[PDB]
């Protein structure tokens, strides 16, 4: 027998009654959301670095301004997610430190280097496109503060994703060198974007509870399939290709069937052994440590 608290909770979830910070919740529900919302907020922060890498090198003042606005928004979104996570009883300073220590994760996609300007448009288009599918799906997540933060975030992000696509369209319609730049960026970011959705439904330890508690509204595989179906026509609009010999339309199912993800790479990356993991965390650790005297100054000034 469930307790009455436990039973009432399951009934709230079934009737789509949003959970609020003052409501009883299973301790495992509280903790999985501190985990997921906290790592969502970590991802906003780390994601500033591969894009920031190109702010000073962007080829036009227009593209530079668009990119600065995007990165400024990412920072704001990190703040919204930390606020939401804090309603669950955690402290931002504490979970941020766990991120610095590699005790909490951030999105796998941010461990990949920006090796060309096309990578920036591709991040704006494919990477932000994948985050949008995942994040719109979370606008009906069961925890209210999280759902409402997703609404606000999604309203802002989809504009930037459109600007990313337009930057890619400029390359797609430009010189042969620009077209090759775009293709090469796609070749390097396509599979990493697919991995943003998470492991297969067979290999997803959090899915059972997250699905039951309506934290997760669609499976990792479902969201990834929708992303592929939505994005393949955009690749075609650019006159570009997908680095997947097994991608094909299956009229039987009405879906694009696509090839197997490299799960060995996925597991290397999420565990700190991807291309830029060390650099990303070094950079944030350096910013934290070197900024210490500044934070201590602000605190000491406030008190006076």
């Amino acid at each position: 027998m469930r307790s009455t608290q436990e039973e009432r909770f399951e009934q709230r979830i079934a009737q789509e009654t949003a959970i609020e910070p003052q409501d009883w919740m299973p301790d495992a529900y509280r903790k999985t959301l501190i985990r997921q919302i906290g790592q969502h907020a970590h991802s906003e922060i780390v994601g500033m670095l591969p894009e920031g890498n190109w702010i000073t090198r962007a080829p036009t003042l227009r593209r530079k301004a668009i990119l600065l606005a995007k990165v400024q928004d990412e920072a704001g979104h990190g703040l919204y997610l930390y606020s939401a996570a804090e309603t669950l009883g955690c402290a931002r300073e504490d979970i941020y430190q766990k991120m610095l220590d590699g005790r909490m994760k951030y999105s796998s996609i941010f461990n990949y280097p920006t090796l060309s300007w096309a990578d920036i448009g591709v991040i704006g288009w494919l990477v932000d496109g994948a985050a949008i599918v995942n994040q719109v799906a979370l606008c009906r997540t069961s925890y209210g503060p999280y759902a409402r933060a997703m609404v606000k975030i999604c309203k802002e992000e989809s504009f930037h994703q459109r600007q990313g696509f337009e930057a890619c369209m400029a390359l797609a319609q430009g010189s042969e060198a620009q077209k090759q730049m775009l293709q090469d960026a796609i070749n390097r970011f396509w599979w990493p974007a697919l991995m943003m959705f998470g492991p297969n439904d067979d290999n997803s330890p959090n899915s059972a509870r997250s699905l039951t508690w309506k934290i997760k509204r669609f499976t990792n595989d479902e969201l990834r399939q929708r992303f592929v179906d939505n994005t393949v026509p955009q690749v075609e609009m650019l006159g570009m290709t997908v680095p997947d010999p097994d991608l094909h339309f299956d009229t039987e199912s009405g879906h694009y069937r696509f090839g197997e993800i490299d799960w060995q790479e996925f597991n290397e990356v999420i565990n700190g052994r991807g291309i830029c993991n060390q650099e990303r965390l070094d950079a944030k650790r350096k910013a934290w440590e070197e900024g210490t005297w500044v934070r201590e100054a602000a605190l000491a000034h406030a008190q006076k």
């Binding site: 000073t56 003042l61 600065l68 400029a170 602000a298």
Partner: protein, 248 residues
């Protein structure tokens, strides 16, 4: 027209170059809130650069903001020496920002009374942003100067290190004077009182000292820069230099 073009370009270059420096901070700030603030300031300044540079190209009858930003070398760039200084530590960045925002406030306040409509309009937009910037930079001057012993020392040193470049803020050449006599430009010599009223008070409030060194460094406006600008331009212009004449 040649004078007006050069004057407009100076103001654009000041904002462009300082925007570049701020962009380097992205993801490296002491707090997420500061990262947000610096990206915001860099974005405003970039917007101002696009406005001034666009008008400069229109005045010259050729090119655009991108030909101006990406196809001129360091000897043609006309920004103040102050805005090309390295970021350094956070106090070095705050000092540079405060000196510039105080100057922008003084300048744009008066430049929105320009007898050139486009310069007046550009300035009327920029002054609103410059006011925000000044609150931020002055706020941080006070927090650092009047924070800890450590932060107080770093802030004093930051101020001392940058002081010699403030001379150029009130340097007038024949372009400045000629355009000012037509009621188009502001004669920078007449900005000193207002800038000193702001900056002297701010430093005092922060519990710091006004440097006694007489400021002596100029040349940015004449394309005579420190050794910092060339490397900034190599980074900024690389892609355009590699793949010229394209749309992005």
């Amino acid at each position: 027209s040649n004078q007006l073009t050069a004057y407009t370009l100076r103001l654009g270059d000041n904002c462009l170059v300082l925007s570049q420096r701020l962009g380097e901070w992205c993801g490296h700030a002491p707090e997420l809130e500061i990262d947000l603030a610096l990206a915001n300031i860099g974005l405003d300044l970039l917007g101002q650069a696009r406005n001034f540079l666009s008008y400069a190209a229109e005045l010259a009858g050729e090119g655009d903001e991108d030909t101006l930003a990406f196809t001129r070398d360091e000897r043609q760039f006309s920004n103040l020496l102050l805005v090309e200084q390295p970021n350094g530590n956070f106090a070095d960045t705050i000092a540079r920002q405060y000196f510039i925002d105080a100057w922008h406030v003084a300048l744009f306040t008066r430049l929105m009374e320009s007898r050139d409509p486009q310069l007046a309009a550009i300035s009327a937009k920029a002054i609103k942003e410059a006011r925000y910037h000044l609150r931020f930079s002055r706020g941080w001057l006070e927090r650092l100067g009047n924070g800890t012993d450590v932060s107080g020392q770093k802030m004093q040193q930051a101020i001392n290190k940058l002081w010699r470049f403030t001379a150029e803020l009130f340097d007038a050449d024949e372009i400045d004077i000629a355009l000012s006599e037509e009621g188009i430009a502001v004669d920078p010599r007449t900005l000193r009182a207002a800038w000193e009223a702001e900056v002297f008070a701010g430093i005092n409030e922060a519990t710091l000292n006004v440097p006694q060194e007489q400021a002596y460094r100029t040349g940015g406006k004449k394309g005579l820069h420190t050794e910092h600008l060339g490397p900034m331009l190599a980074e900024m212009q690389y892609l355009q230099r590699v793949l010229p004449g394209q749309q992005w």
